[PDB]
Design a protein around this ligand. Structure first.
Ligand SMILES: N[C@H](CC(=O)O)Cc1ccccc1
Ligand code: NA
Ligand code: NA
Ligand code: NA
Ligand code: NA
Ligand code: NA
Ligand code: NA
Ligand SMILES: [Zn+2]
Length: 866
């Protein structure tokens, strides 16, 4: 399998302007007829090269003439000797029931549905499967009326009929030209939740949510979120929906979260279905985010699409930024920002230090489905947020307006977007563009000096990005570096120099530079990299007292959390080193005191308190170390939880009780209180055993919502409490028929600290609720073990690696996309000690030798073994 390169992009020799599709649908054999209107742009002697994968070609006609001047090659149908304008007709067969990979046209339970992004449409017919070819689609679907009473595609229904032998048909038309990755088809039997939204200018939109029969009770929150998303995009971005119907279909078998097909989004049911007894606060908020996300793509991805797949972040970074702004505006902006920062520092930084490191606009790709990444999405969004920081809201919106004005109805590039922002705002983004081309995490080092004689404070800021495996050459970036200076009373010191105010977003553009501020009347405590203003590691030699001072006084809640993170990082690193020497946890009294104060502060927002009281995950902890010791990190996390539970026991119980709520509401103030209460509960579970067991068992039994039940169950597992086995059985007995709810329980099994966790996980491959055919089940059991239980995964005997090899051996052939997601923990081997590296390398070498190794795994394995 061959790498493709961004610098090799060239405009297509042929365009397709209009395609008429007919599907004679059947699970075993579907017949596709595709009539395309084509136009030659290249030389008269260039052939038309159509992509196709696993298609049985039936016939090829050019203007209704059976064509002889063609050949099939690996992945292609190459058609020679064509006129300048012509009608291409292809008939071909495919087999939905054989499609275990879930790319193209496949079966999800009894429904048929599609996934075409990135290069899945070529699994349906021979086409110009590239996103710079936009065509007007009409889609006629013919099927068994009893099995498939609903036949859906993009746009509006234009024709319908009934046939003999119990078949019927529906034809759809979408007036907006689209790349084929935005094509969708759905056939099946559903319950349909129907609603309407009226746009600001008066366009009436029919909203239709299709769910499996029996699930209408779980649909209203997703419908509500859709209306919320539509309203927000109008208020914040000035964007309205552009069609007459908005269809969402919830399917149980899906490789990612959801997909923005124009007017017909297809969602993993995990990001649709919610009831208060089945879904947690986090599930509700994730539904909200993902509903929003797909909706936001209607403009940022559909009305303006991607020229080529190396431009993926053009739509993904921007749409993730939008979904974060949506969540943040409707909910707690501080909690959103906190959680997105946790993702960046703990999951994305790790990728940027891995063999799979890439810039947000990649230069080289073997399998494009490997580049739907934390980098492209989350780091992408941080890049867009840097633009927002540099420009301000008003100029940023002017940029958005110019981007759409120039590019509406076309496929564009990352560079076009940056250019729109620069031209609308008059801010120079030439240097800033380097964020698109350079991989790896920059390290920003800050040193300070206060001069009492001149009342001047000097910051000396330096930047470096370490080389990555993809790029030996690194240069300085344009780093927006936001600061605030605090006096001894906690008040903000105005930033100024030579009698003029200085913007608090410093432009850090050199390897090293100095910034000098005047009229600094007291030695400052700085808040540095405010609201994580660039996606960088900060190196500043904080005292513990500066950090606890910021925890009390900083004016943005984010900085209060972030200071607590920096305080904890010191003592996490201490205690991991101690663990490796056989010594127990050591923590200064004044550190415990700082967290006590958070618990007892009656003015602090409980949302903020809850996050300060949520310890960094084992993933975020790992990023503090050059060499990861996953057992020490897991044990230190536990010991720190135990020590805090003991030291703060009375305060924890008092806050736990004070935040009791009898009514359950999916409302932000209530969510915050409950997050704080359950954060207290987690510590209390690790206190004295009898009280822990009683508190946790009683919460599990008395809970009137899954947030509270699951928090108790999760605490019983984590603390290995006496009640654990009974509670886990109770949950299985009640919920085994419900896969989404059982996912939570598989995660708890997979992430258990028990010594026999791997044995239990293997045994669960036979559980009544588990199946290797379902990506959600795979991810919740196997993925969670490998990715979220690094202590067990990285068991010194190598057993975790062997288990993953066995699962990947099946998944490589069944569902390579899922396989490639699951291999990620093994490609991190160079972060581990020599003995672990050796075992992980041997595991990778076994996988490299697989017969029929997928391109998906090949890419990652060869980068890892290099
Ligand atoms: N654009 C889709 C998701 C999203 O970012 O909206 C990407 C996707 C790729 C592969 C399978 C499913 C979905
Ligand atoms: Na013709
Ligand atoms: Na076109
Ligand atoms: Na009708
Ligand atoms: Na808000
Ligand atoms: Na593929
Ligand atoms: Na099973
Ligand atoms: Zn997206």
């Amino acid at each position: 399998p061959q790498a493709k390169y961004r610098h090799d992009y060239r405009a297509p020799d042929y365009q397709i302007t209009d395609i008429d599709l007919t599907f004679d649908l059947d699970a075993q054999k579907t017949v596709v007829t595709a009539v395309s209107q084509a136009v030659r742009h290249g030389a008269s002697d260039a052939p038309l090269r159509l992509n196709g994968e696993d298609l049985k070609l039936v016939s090829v006609h050019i203007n209704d003439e059976p064509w002889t001047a063609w050949k099939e090659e690996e992945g292609a149908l190459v058609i020679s000797n064509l006129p300048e304008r012509f009608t291409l007709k292809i008939i071909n067969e495919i087999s939905p029931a054989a499609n275990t990979a879930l790319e193209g046209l496949y079966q999800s339970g009894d429904a048929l549905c599609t996934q075409c992004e990135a290069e899945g449409f070529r699994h349906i017919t021979y086409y110009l499967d590239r996103p710079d070819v936009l065509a007007r689609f009409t889609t006629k679907i013919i099927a068994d009326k009893i099995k498939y009473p609903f036949l859906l595609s993009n746009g509006n229904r234009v024709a319908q009929g009934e046939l003999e032998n119990g078949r019927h048909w529906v034809q759809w038309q979408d007036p907006f030209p689209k790349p084929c990755y935005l094509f969708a088809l759905v056939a099946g039997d559903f319950d349909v939740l129907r609603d309407t939204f009226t746009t600001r200018s008066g366009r009436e939109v029919a909203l239709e949510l299709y769910v499996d029969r029996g699930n209408l009770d779980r649909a209203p929150w997703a419908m509500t979120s859709l209306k919320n998303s539509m309203k927000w995009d109008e208020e914040r971005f000035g964007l309205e929906y552009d069609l007459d119907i908005y269809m969402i279909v919830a399917v149980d078998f899906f490789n990612m979260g959801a997909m923005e097909n124009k007017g017909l989004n297809i969602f993993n049911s995990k990001y649709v279905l919610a009831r208060t007894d089945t879904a947690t606060d986090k599930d509700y908020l994730d539904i909200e985010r993902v509903i929003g996300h797909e909706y936001f793509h209607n403009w940022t991805g559909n009305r303006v699409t991607c020229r080529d797949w190396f431009q993926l972040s053009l739509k993904e970074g921007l749409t993730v930024f939008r979904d974060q702004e949506f969540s943040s505006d409707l909910g707690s902006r501080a909690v959103n920002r906190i959680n997105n920062v946790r993702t960046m520092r703990g999951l994305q930084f790790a990728e940027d230090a891995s063999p799979m490191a890439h810039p947000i606009r990649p230069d080289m790709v073997i399998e494009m489905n490997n580049f739907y990444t934390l980098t492209v999405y989350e780091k992408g969004a941080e890049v867009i947020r840097m633009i927002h920081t540099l420009l301000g809201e008003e100029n940023f919106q002017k940029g958005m307006q110019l981007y759409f004005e120039r590019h509406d109805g076309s496929a564009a590039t990352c560079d076009d977007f940056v250019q729109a922002m620069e031209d609308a705002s008059n801010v120079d983004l030439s240097h800033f563009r380097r964020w698109y081309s350079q991989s790896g995490t920059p390290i920003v080092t800050v040193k300070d000096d206060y001069n009492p004689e001149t009342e001047q404070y000097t910051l000396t800021i330096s930047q470096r990005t370490p080389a990555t495996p993809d790029q030996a050459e690194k240069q300085p970036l344009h780093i927006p570096f936001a600061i605030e200076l605090y006096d001894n009373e906690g008040k903000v010191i105005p930033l100024q120099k030579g009698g003029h105010p200085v913007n608090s977003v410093l432009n850090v553009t050199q390897a090293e530079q100095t910034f000098v501020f005047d009229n600094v009347y007291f030695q400052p405590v700085p808040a540095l990299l405010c609201e994580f203003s660039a996606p960088v590691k900060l190196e500043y030699k904080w005292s513990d007292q500066q950090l606890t001072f910021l925890m009390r006084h900083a004016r943005n809640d984010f900085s209060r959390w972030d200071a607590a993170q920096s305080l904890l990082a010191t003592y996490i690193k201490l205690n991991v080193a101690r663990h490796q020497q056989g010594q127990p946890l050591s923590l200064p009294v004044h550190v415990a005191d700082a967290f006590r104060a958070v618990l007892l502060d009656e003015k602090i927002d409980p949302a903020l308190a809850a996050e300060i009281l949520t310890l960094p995950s084992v993933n975020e902890m790992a990023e503090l170390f050059d060499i990861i010791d996953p057992i020490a990190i897991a044990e230190v996390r536990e010991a720190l939880t135990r020590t805090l539970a003991t030291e703060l026991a009375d305060e924890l119980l008092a806050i736990y009780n004070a935040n009791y709520q009898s009514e359950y509401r999916v409302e932000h103030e209530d969510i915050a209180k409950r997050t704080l209460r359950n954060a207290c509960l987690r510590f209390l579970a690790f206190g004295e055993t009898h009280l822990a067991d009683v508190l946790v068992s009683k919460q599990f039994h008395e809970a009137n919502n899954m947030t509270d039940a699951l928090a108790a169950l999760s605490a019983a597992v984590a603390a290995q409490l006496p009640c654990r086995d009974a509670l886990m059985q109770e949950y299985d007995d009640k919920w085994h028929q419900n896969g989404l709810v059982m996912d939570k329980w598989f995660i708890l099994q997979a992430t258990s600290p028990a010594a026999n966790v791997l044995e239990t996980v293997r045994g669960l491959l036979q559980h009544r609720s588990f199946t290797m055919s379902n990506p959600n089940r795979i991810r919740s059991l196997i993925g969670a073990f490998a990715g979220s239980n690094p202590a067990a995964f990285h068991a010194e005997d190598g057993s975790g690696y062997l288990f993953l090899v066995e699962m990947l051996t099946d998944l490589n052939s069944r569902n390579p996309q899922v396989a490639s997601r699951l291999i990620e923990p093994l490609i991190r081997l160079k972060r581990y000690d020599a003995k672990r590296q050796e075992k992980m390398r041997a595991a990778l070498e076994q996988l490299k030798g697989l017969e029929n190794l997928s391109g998906d795994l090949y890419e990652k394995i060869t980068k890892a073994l290099a």
